[PDB]
RNA sequence: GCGAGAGACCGAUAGCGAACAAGUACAGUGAUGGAAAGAUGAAAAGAACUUUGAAAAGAGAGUGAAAAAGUACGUGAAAUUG
RNA sequence: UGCUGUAAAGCUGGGUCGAACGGCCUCUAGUGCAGAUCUUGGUGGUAGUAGCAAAUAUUCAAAUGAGAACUUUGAAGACUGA
RNA sequence: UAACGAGAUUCCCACUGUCCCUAUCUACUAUCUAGCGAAACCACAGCCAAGGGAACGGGCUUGGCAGAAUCAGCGGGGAAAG
């Protein structure tokens, strides 16, 4: 088990945003992405890249894409008091299509 | 003053209180009366409501316009993997009612029934029935003593049997364990039958025949808190009524200066324990048959499962019971099938049923093919087929 | 760290509305000390304060 | 100042006070009763879990028409809450009294909340505006909080004597 | 009005509306209407200094005959509350 | 803490408190409260309850700060739409 | 009496959930949480039946009965409040 690790995931935001108030779909996709990263990195501390916020909101408040490719990297929190030893950083991955991609471990090189 | 116009009341007073069932498993309130002359046989079984389907059948009812004519009927499928006998209970007649005297368990219990005794199985030492299993130490004389007690004193013998839920598509791992009364023979015969069946499987074929009338015990579909208009079927108030219209306008007279129990109020709806009677067993299918849904007229190599499986259930890969009409409960519900409490000699009950055809189109949409081979024959090659 | 005054000043010096004034987020200490219109002019000339381009309203479809 | 309860041994006790705290009295009373008699370090862990919504404060007296929760089973109740403003003030006074005890030389591992109580403070008056041009009251109900940490013959008749003596003669 | 002396007068919800920056604050377009509000101690000697705290504060300490007198100040009732 | 008196009440033990007060013979009166939708002041239950819902809509980051849904700045998404 | 009428009335066509006979859906509430936090009302209180009674009792008499603490609704009663 390595604490510092980077992986690429696909999140099916379409099924997570089902039935959601139209004026909250992009706001809720922010919360869903934070909840998604905790499920995988085990960290309550999730930080979203501002370029990710641009990707979510690119089509207005309810035009969230059905799938987004995310690069989630677990980093060490040196700040004191941290009260959360690690934290997750989510930033977007540009791919021609978000279909048929599996979870892939990224080698920081 | 009297009502201006007479009308029947809304709803039945025989089904109060309209509260949630205490247990999700329906319990058999009454068992068929015991006849000593009959051979020793079970009286009930546990299955799972898979889903509803359609059949075609030639009606045999002289004097009816549909006599010797095809009728399209709704049917319900009950996935019934064989039950495992694990215990025996003796009941003694007392002036205060039946009283359980002695419970004797089998030496070995499967893990799925031992999970029944745990709220947090993954954090347990799983100590259930370990000392009891040790009580079988090379002589099992304590077990024989208890069985002799049951033979000597008990007047009603019931068997503790559980379902093999691992054979169903449900994600639940706890088995369902229930008491099933044994009928026929003397108490000694019943206890001998129960002992000879410990850890053995009993199938529906040995409990229910085809064309039988059986009863269904189940907890109905829940709807949560519901208003009087839908809970009781009362009349909606006019459109122009202040503060809303889905109400009962008068909930009582001035006297008695109380609200009567017979007045409709909002409350919990559905998820009630219900016994439904006189359901005809159209089919007793076998899990080993690869042509479950094939009949003598539609020889298609076809299982009971529709295309895409049963919606929100999965596939019925076990022995199953095909019943006429609808039964209480939802998909995945555990359903208790009971034998009839009386003898019905009406033509509707003694009828022999021969199925013409069983619908296996997809339940997930307007399905229009009974079989993927039929789909391909009708549509030809697709781009994904190359 | 309260650049409300500077943005109001920069709008008047540049001659556009406050919606078209860009204050460098990395130059907060520099902008915070720009208390006079003279100081705002220097920052405008150096590129610390930038007049954001007007949003385009093309007449191409009208034509 | 005079505290309501004086400690049995003043040398092994430390006290903290808070007056005119603008926190709900009813919420603070319940959170003070939830940790009364606890170990000091035990109560501090509990108060942090209440802020995280992992554990709740049982509302016992001022609980009319509040919600029901499963986190009240720990205390044998159905009505519990997670009052953040009240927990933060109490944690503040627990930290002050713990620092008060450390200056005395007491051991924080042995400290117990022997006495905690909440009293009413004078109200703060505001105004609310009602239909048909009426003014009502919009008061606050502040609290005084104080807490103290602590470390952990027969005479007989003539014939009663006579009966006693004669029975003793029987036993040699 | 000016200046005095008194009383079986009232004693701070009393006595003038006003024992106090009272015909004041405040209300009303206006004519007009019109309050509440006394008392640490002999003396501020009104809490230096240390410590916890972002601070308010607290705990020590100190002043004092008294802090069961700390300006939210003599005594400190009842409702009501811990 | 008790004692005395049928009672109205009187006296006393303990605690608190800090400057005046009682008995007896007479005099005198703005002299005895449970009520008056009493007056003024205060405090409850209700009750941590009703509720804090018109005006399309906010989100990410950085800074500041003890502390940031709400401050500032940037990026974005919006709206008013002469 | 032409024209005119947010005037009153009857009939006809069109139209329709007004209705037979309801059902489903959306937003904001209600619900739960953090913060904030009132008011009306209040003799005491709050289970029924019959009796008698200022002739329609929560209390009285005689019976039925009667088990902590409560949440969401509801509109029979409190001859509820105003």
Determine if strand F comes within 7 Å of the CB of A104: no
What positions of strand F are covered by protein, i.e. any atom < 7 Å from a CB?
43-44, 46-50, 56-64, 71-78
Distance from the first to the final alpha carbon of chain D? 69
CA gap B193, B38 in Å, rounded: 14
CA torsion through residues B311, B312, B315, B320, sign = negative
Return the closest-CA partner of residue C43 out of C52, C32, C55: C32
D136 touches strand F (CB under 7 A): no
Q: What is the phi/psi pair of residue B69, to 5°?
A: -130, 145
* Way it was determined: cryo-EM
Cα–Cα dist A68/A56, whole Å: 9
Q: Which nucleotide is nearest to B229 (CA to C1')?
A: G22
Q: Is the CB of D143 under 7 A from strand F?
A: no
User: Do the beta carbons of residue B245 and residue B239 sit within 8 Å?
Assistant: yes
Residue D137 CB burial class (10 angstroms; 0-12, 13-18, ≥19): exposed
Which token pair is D101? 């005890």
Instruction: Provide residues 6-35 of D with CB closer than 7 Å to any strand F atom.
Output: 24-27
Give the separation between CA A6 and CA B106, rounded to whole angstroms: 53
Residue-by-residue DSSP string for B190-245: HHHHHHHTBT-EE-GGGT--TT-EEEEEEE--EEEEE-HHHHH-PPPPPTT-TT-S
In chain D, after which residues is the C-to-N distance over 2.5 Å, breaking the chain?
A: 152
Tell me the nt nearest to D62, Cα to C1'.
F48
* Residue from A6, A5, A9 nearest A98 by CA: A9
Query: Among all chains, which residue has been given the structure tokens 């076990």?
Result: B318
Of the candidates B288, B326, B325, the residue with the CA atom closest to the CA atom of residue B304: B288
Distance CA B98, CA B89 (A): 12
Protein-covered nucleotides of chain E (CB closer than 7 Å) are 51-53, 55-60, 67-68, 72, 81-82
Query: Which of these, B35, B45, B340, B38, lies nearest to B201 by C-alpha position?
Result: B45
Omega before B234 within 30 of 0, i.e. cis: no
Kind plus residue range of the DSSP H or E element containing D7: none
Nearest to A13 by CA among A67, A51, A57: A67
C63 CB below 7 A from strand F atoms: no
Q: Round to whole Å and give the CA distance between B164 and B252.
A: 52
Contacting subunits of A (3+ beta carbon pairs below 8 A): none
| E strand or H helix at C43 | helix C37-46
> Which nucleotide has its C1' atom closest to residue C18's CA?
F73
Do A7 and A36 form a contact (C-beta atoms < 8 A)? no
The Cβ of residue B312 has, within 10 Å, a number of other Cβ atoms equal to 13
Strand F atom within 7 Å of D63 CB? yes
């Amino acid at each position: 088990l390595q604490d510092v690790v980077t992986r690429e995931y696909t999140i099916n935001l379409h099924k997570r945003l089902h039935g959601v108030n139209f004026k909250k779909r992009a706001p809720k996709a922010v919360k869903e992405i934070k909840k998604f990263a905790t499920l995988h990195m085990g960290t309550t501390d999730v930080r979203l890249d501002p370029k990710l916020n641009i990707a979510i909101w690119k089509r207005g408040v309810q035009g969230v894409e059905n799938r987004m490719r995310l690069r989630i990297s677990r980093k060490r929190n040196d700040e004191e008091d941290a009260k959360e030893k690690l934290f997750a950083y989510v930033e977007p991955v540009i791919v021609p299509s978000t279909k048929g991609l599996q979870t892939v471990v990224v080698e920081d090189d | 003053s009297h009502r201006k116009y007479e009308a029947p009341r809304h709803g039945s007073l025989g089904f109060l209180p309209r509260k949630r069932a205490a247990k999700q498993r329906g319990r058999v309130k009454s068992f068929p009366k015991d006849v000593k002359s009959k051979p020793v046989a079970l009286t009930a079984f546990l299955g799972y409501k898979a889903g509803m389907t359609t059949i075609v059948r030639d009606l045999d009812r002289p004097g009816s316009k549909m006599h010797k004519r095809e009728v399209v009927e709704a049917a319900t499928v009950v996935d019934t993997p064989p039950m495992v006998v694990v215990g025996v209970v003796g009941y003694v007649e007392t002036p205060r009612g039946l009283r359980s005297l002695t419970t004797v368990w089998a030496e070995h219990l499967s893990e799925e029934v031992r999970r029944r005794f745990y709220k947090n199985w993954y954090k347990s030492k799983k100590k259930a029935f370990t000392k009891y299993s040790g009580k079988y130490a090379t002589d099992a004389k304590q077990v024989e003593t208890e069985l002799a007690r049951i033979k000597k004193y008990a007047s009603v013998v019931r068997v503790l049997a559980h379902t093999q839920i691992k054979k169903t598509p449900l994600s639940q791992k706890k088995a369902h364990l229930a008491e099933i009364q044994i009928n026929g023979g003397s108490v000694s015969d019943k206890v001998d039958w129960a002992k000879e069946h410990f850890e053995k499987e009993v199938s529906v074929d040995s409990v229910f025949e085809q064309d039988e009338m059986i009863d269904v015990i189940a907890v109905t579909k829940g709807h949560g808190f519901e208003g009087v208009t839908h809970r009781w079927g009362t009349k909606k108030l006019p459109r122009k009524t202040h503060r809303g219209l889905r109400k009962v306008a008068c909930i009582g007279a001035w006297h008695p200066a109380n609200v009567n129990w017979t007045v409709a109020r909002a409350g919990q709806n559905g998820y009630h324990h219900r016994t439904s009677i006189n359901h005809k067993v159209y089919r007793v299918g076998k899990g080993t048959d690869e042509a479950n849904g094939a009949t003598e007229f539609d020889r298609t190599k076809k299982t009971i499962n529709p295309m895409g499986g049963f919606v929100r259930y999965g596939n019925v890969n076990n022995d199953f019971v095909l019943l006429k009409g609808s039964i209480p409960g939802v998909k995945k519900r555990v359903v208790t099938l009971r034998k009839s409490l009386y003898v019905d000699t009406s033509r509707r009950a003694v009828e022999k049923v021969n199925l013409k055809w069983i619908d296996t189109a997809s339940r997930f949409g307007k399905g229009r093919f009974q079989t993927p081979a039929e789909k391909h024959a009708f549509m030809g090659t697709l781009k994904k087929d190359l | 760290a309260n650049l409300r005054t500077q943005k109001r000043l920069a709008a008047s010096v540049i001659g556009v509305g406050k919606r078209k004034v860009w204050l460098d987020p990395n130059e907060t200490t520099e902008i915070a000390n720009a208390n006079s219109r003279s100081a705002i002019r220097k920052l405008y000339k150096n590129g610390t304060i930038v007049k954001k381009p007007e949003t385009v309203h093309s007449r191409s479809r009208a034509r | 100042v005079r505290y309501a309860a004086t400690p049995a041994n003043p040398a092994k006790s430390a006290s903290a006070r808070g007056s005119y705290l603008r926190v709900s009295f009813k919420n603070t009373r319940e959170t003070a009763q939830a940790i009364n008699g606890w170990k000091l370090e035990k109560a501090q862990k509990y108060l942090d879990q209440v802020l995280d919504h992992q554990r709740a404060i049982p509302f016992r007296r001022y609980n009319s028409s509040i919600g029901r929760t499963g986190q009240g089973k720990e205390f044998g109740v159905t009505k519990a809450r997670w009052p953040a403003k009240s927990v933060n003030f109490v944690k503040d006074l627990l930290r002050n009294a713990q620092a008060n005890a450390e200056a005395k030389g007491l051991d924080s591992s042995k400290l117990v909340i022997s006495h905690i109580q909440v009293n009413h403070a004078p109200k703060q008056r505001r105004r609310t505006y009602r239909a048909h041009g009426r003014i009502n009251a919009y008061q606050s109900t502040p609290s005084h909080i104080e807490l103290t940490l602590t470390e952990e013959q027969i005479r007989l008749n003539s014939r009663q004597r006579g009966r006693l003596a004669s029975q003793k003669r029987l036993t040699a």
